[PDB]
Design an enzyme around this catalytic site. Structure first.
Site, PDB file in Angstrom:
ATOM      1  N   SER A 110      35.236  34.407  42.259  1.00 58.75           N
ATOM      2  CA  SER A 110      34.643  34.433  40.928  1.00 58.75           C
ATOM      3  C   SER A 110      34.605  35.879  40.468  1.00 58.75           C
ATOM      4  O   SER A 110      33.900  36.702  41.061  1.00 58.75           O
ATOM      5  CB  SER A 110      33.242  33.832  40.917  1.00 58.75           C
ATOM      6  OG  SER A 110      32.674  33.922  39.624  1.00 58.75           O
ATOM      7  N   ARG A 111      35.356  36.185  39.419  1.00 61.39           N
ATOM      8  CA  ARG A 111      35.574  37.569  39.033  1.00 61.39           C
ATOM      9  C   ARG A 111      34.517  38.082  38.067  1.00 61.39           C
ATOM     10  O   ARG A 111      34.408  39.298  37.875  1.00 61.39           O
ATOM     11  CB  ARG A 111      36.977  37.701  38.444  1.00 61.39           C
ATOM     12  CG  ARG A 111      38.008  37.143  39.418  1.00 61.39           C
ATOM     13  CD  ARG A 111      39.432  37.219  38.933  1.00 61.39           C
ATOM     14  NE  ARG A 111      39.964  38.568  39.029  1.00 61.39           N
ATOM     15  CZ  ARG A 111      40.152  39.355  37.983  1.00 61.39           C
ATOM     16  NH1 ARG A 111      39.826  38.920  36.779  1.00 61.39           N
ATOM     17  NH2 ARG A 111      40.644  40.574  38.140  1.00 61.39           N
ATOM     18  N   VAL A 112      33.744  37.185  37.459  1.00 57.10           N
ATOM     19  CA  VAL A 112      32.526  37.579  36.760  1.00 57.10           C
ATOM     20  C   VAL A 112      31.390  37.760  37.759  1.00 57.10           C
ATOM     21  O   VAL A 112      30.515  38.612  37.561  1.00 57.10           O
ATOM     22  CB  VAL A 112      32.193  36.528  35.681  1.00 57.10           C
ATOM     23  CG1 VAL A 112      30.921  36.862  34.918  1.00 57.10           C
ATOM     24  CG2 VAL A 112      33.345  36.396  34.719  1.00 57.10           C
TER      25      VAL A 112
END
Lengths: 129, 283, 116, 72, 71, 72, 71, 116
Positions: F5-7
């Site tokens: 998950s890049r957020v």
């Protein structure tokens, strides 16, 4: 005729000595060639090989004597040659530390290769075709 | 069929083949040193066998508690396993035959006691909830005499207290590098004994009884150490055979995966050439 | 579970769990063998061979192929069968006794016809 | 092991021709056994001498930039 | 080393035919001294890029492609 | 392990960050140390306790069908 | 055996159209004795050669191919 | 070494060698532990951790997040710092105080601020 001191680890002192005077658990002994077949359990002491002009001390731990008229056979479990009895208890602790570090080394030498083999089998399990 | 995955699987099984080949060579050198250690033990064993035969088989000698068979109220077990794995059917065969001979004829946990040699047998009999009264582990690859000597004198002195009433040995007999036969050797009472085809009478310097009281524990310890060296030699040979079979299985997997690699390689190049020529025909 | 039942669902998912665990071990079995599995993976392989063979079944259509007359197995019978295998009731029987067999009563009669 | 010169052997002076033929064998015996050299006292003189001469062969065959060594 | 060498350059910003014709200029400058009796070393840094440039020219000229669209 | 998950972290609430920052470490340690528990001799007591924590982590992260759990 | 056998041959040097119609020629010769009430054995030595020949003929007809480039 | 110089090339190559020797003992440290390795490879992992934490800096743009002002470290001073760590001058300082500092005098000041 000749004496032969052996050990479960290996033979120690085989020579051509006509006089041995090892102490048994009953008491002193004296062996010249032509002796009767005699059997004696040896005490923790040194065997005196004094027929070559000078004495030769050989220690026994455990210890057992099998003298033939043909030859002399000593069944020992520890057969140090310096044979001042404190040196046997010193070399026992020295080789105790030696075999303890050897038993650690022979286990880590297995476990490193076993980790290599486990990671190499992990790569087959991850690859999975 | 995902050509890059087949290539990585080929590389991984090649590396497993390399590791198992190195383990085979290490265990081959250890088997050589174990055979040298057994050949070093041989003359002490033949001399102690000669002396014990000529003493215990002549002029009675059955008055000692280690010659005559006392009535059996318990049974000892000296099980010789390995400290380390990667031997194939070494520990499985030994511990299986011990478990069968215990559960066959006792049916009570108080009628037996087990002395193990090795962490594998110790973990076996603690998973199976059996008594492991003497339990040393962590032996070297070429073991000396003192480390097995202290547990051997404790075993013989625990017989001499009247506890075991008999005991047996269990170990893999090294014959030649591929079989490793499982043996059940009765350790003591020393009923099974044979003279060396010709005998000379002996003079007993204290008496016959004190000579037996010193000699027969030493003969039992020599039997235990001979079985222990023979079992360590069969351990190194069984690990050698297991790693050789691992290399053979890895190489068979290599050749089948290279066949599938060549199939996927041909399919990949014909797919990409069909795509390129269809795109060129599109114009 | 709301369509078939709770016990059917538990038996089916546990069969799938043991077969997936046996599928994840086939590299270790194929290279190193059955010798280095840590005594629960041996139990998984031992029950999973029995499960993978007891999934096989004789057909009425395959009577013209082999001569075996074939069987029809109700759902409760095969759920009870796979539950008895997953509990370890038939660990003493040989694994080739489960091949092409309708019920576990037929497993037992085939295994005593084999000699066990 | 993977590089080859199909002319080569005829592309050497006689001094290099006498000597490089056994360095080829030393590199073959070392690169076959360098993946086996991490653990174990395998053999006393049959494999440790090969690994020693090959590990020194690798150190011989290293150079730095812009320093061409003459042939002799 | 620049007392005896010739450097033929066709960089990536140059058009694809100059990339394609750099090695042929190399042999055309070497064969002069070869047929005058002298000995020449010619070095081709990344002929794969010359192959890709000729692939580019053959695809833009709409020649029928083969494997990996090389002609 | 593979899921990213890049957020991530800005999406969680302040309680979930404090609680899950060690959940990820325990599950990553279990995924790394499970690879040596497939075959072989054994592992010592510390990373076996790590494997036990990771097995209970896996048993926590399982859900049933159409049963969403609130964040609190 | 030549009292009852027929040999229909199309070798490797023959073009792929004759390789395409060899087994169909064999079955058209067998259908006569089949529909007259007699029994016929027909052997096709390497139908994979027929598959490769029809694959050749369809690629020369510029038909778009499938897997292993067979149509 | 034709571009960075001889000293920078030797220090960088030795840092790469000790960090590559450290990324060969990772499974051994993670499984078999620190007590069992050797007293020659634990020196390698000792200096490897001291180098691996000295590779990190405090940034100027991370000043608003941590309060630490951040540093611009020239090439000569970082080559001197990694050379002094490779020689063994800073083995007595702890595993931290290499964490998030610019120069090696900042390592000395932070280790004196930690009490050592």
């Amino acid at each position: 005729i000749h004496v032969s001191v052996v050990t479960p680890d290996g033979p120690v002192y085989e020579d051509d000595v006509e006089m041995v005077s090892v102490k048994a658990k009953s008491g002193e002994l004296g062996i010249l060639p032509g002796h009767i077949p005699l059997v004696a359990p040896l005490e923790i002491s040194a065997a005196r090989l004094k027929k070559g002009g000078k004495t030769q001390y050989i220690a026994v731990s455990g210890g057992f004597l099998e003298v033939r008229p043909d030859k002399v056979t000593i069944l020992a479990q520890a057969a140090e040659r310096a044979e001042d009895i404190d040196v046997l208890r010193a070399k026992a602790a020295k080789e105790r530390a030696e075999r303890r570090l050897q038993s650690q080394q022979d286990d880590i030498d297995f476990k490193r290769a076993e980790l290599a083999l486990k990671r190499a089998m992990n790569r087959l399990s991850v690859a999975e075709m | 069929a995902s050509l890059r995955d087949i290539k990585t699987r080929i590389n991984a099984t090649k590396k497993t083949s390399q590791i198992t080949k190195a383990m085979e060579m290490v265990s081959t050198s250890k088997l050589n040193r174990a055979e040298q250690n057994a050949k070093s033990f041989v003359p002490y064993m033949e001399k102690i066998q000669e002396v014990v035969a000529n003493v215990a088989l002549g002029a009675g000698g059955a008055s000692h508690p280690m010659l005559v068979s006392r009535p059996v109220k318990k049974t000892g077990y000296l099980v010789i396993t390995s400290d380390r794995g990667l031997a194939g059917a070494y520990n499985s065969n030994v511990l299986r035959l011990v478990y069968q001979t215990i559960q066959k004829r006792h049916a009570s946990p108080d009628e037996y006691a087990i002395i193990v040699i090795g962490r594998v047998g110790l973990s076996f009999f603690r998973k199976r909830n059996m008594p492991v009264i003497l339990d040393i582990t962590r032996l070297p690859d070429q073991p000396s005499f003192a480390d097995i000597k202290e547990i051997a004198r404790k075993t013989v002195g625990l017989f001499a207290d009247g506890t075991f009433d008999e005991l047996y040995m269990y170990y893999n007999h090294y014959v030649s590098a591929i079989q490793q036969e499982v043996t059940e050797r009765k350790l003591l009472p020393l009923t099974d004994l044979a003279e060396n085809k010709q005998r000379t009478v002996y003079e007993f310097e204290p008496s016959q009884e004190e000579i037996l009281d010193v000699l027969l524990p030493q003969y039992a310890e020599s039997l235990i150490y001979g079985a222990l060296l023979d079992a360590k030699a069969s351990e190194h040979a069984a690990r050698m055979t297991a790693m050789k079979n691992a290399t053979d299985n890895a190489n068979e997997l290599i050749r089948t995966l290279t066949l599938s690699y060549n199939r996927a390689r041909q399919a990949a190049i014909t797919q990409e050439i069909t795509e390129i020529v269809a795109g060129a025909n599109a114009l | 579970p709301e369509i078939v039942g709770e016990e059917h669902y538990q038996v089916a998912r546990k069969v799938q769990q043991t077969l997936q665990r046996y599928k994840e071990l086939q590299d270790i079995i194929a290279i190193l063998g059955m010798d280095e599995l840590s005594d629960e993976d041996k139990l998984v392989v031992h029950r999973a061979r029995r499960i993978q063979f007891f999934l096989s079944q004789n057909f009425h259509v395959a009577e013209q192929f082999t001569g075996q007359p074939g069987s029809y197995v109700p759902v409760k019978e095969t759920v009870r069968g796979f539950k008895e295998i997953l509990e370890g009731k038939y660990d003493h029987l040989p694994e080739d006794a489960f091949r092409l067999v309708g019920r576990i009563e037929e497993v037992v009669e085939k295994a005593k016809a084999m000699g066990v | 092991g993977l590089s080859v010169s199909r002319v080569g052997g005829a592309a050497q002076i006689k001094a290099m021709k006498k000597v490089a033929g056994t360095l080829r064998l030393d590199l073959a015996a070392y690169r076959e056994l360098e993946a086996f050299a991490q653990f174990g006292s395998d053999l006393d003189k049959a494999t440790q001498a090969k690994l020693a001469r090959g590990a020194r062969t690798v150190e011989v065959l290293k150079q730095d930039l812009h320093q061409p060594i003459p042939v002799e | 080393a620049l007392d005896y060498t010739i450097v033929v350059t066709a960089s990536a910003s140059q058009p694809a035919p100059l990339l394609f014709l750099a090695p042929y200029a190399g042999v055309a400058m070497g064969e002069y001294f070869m047929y005058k009796g002298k000995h020449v070393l010619v070095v081709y840094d990344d002929l794969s890029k010359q192959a890709a440039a000729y692939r580019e020219l053959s695809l833009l000229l709409r020649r029928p492609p083969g494997r990996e669209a090389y002609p």
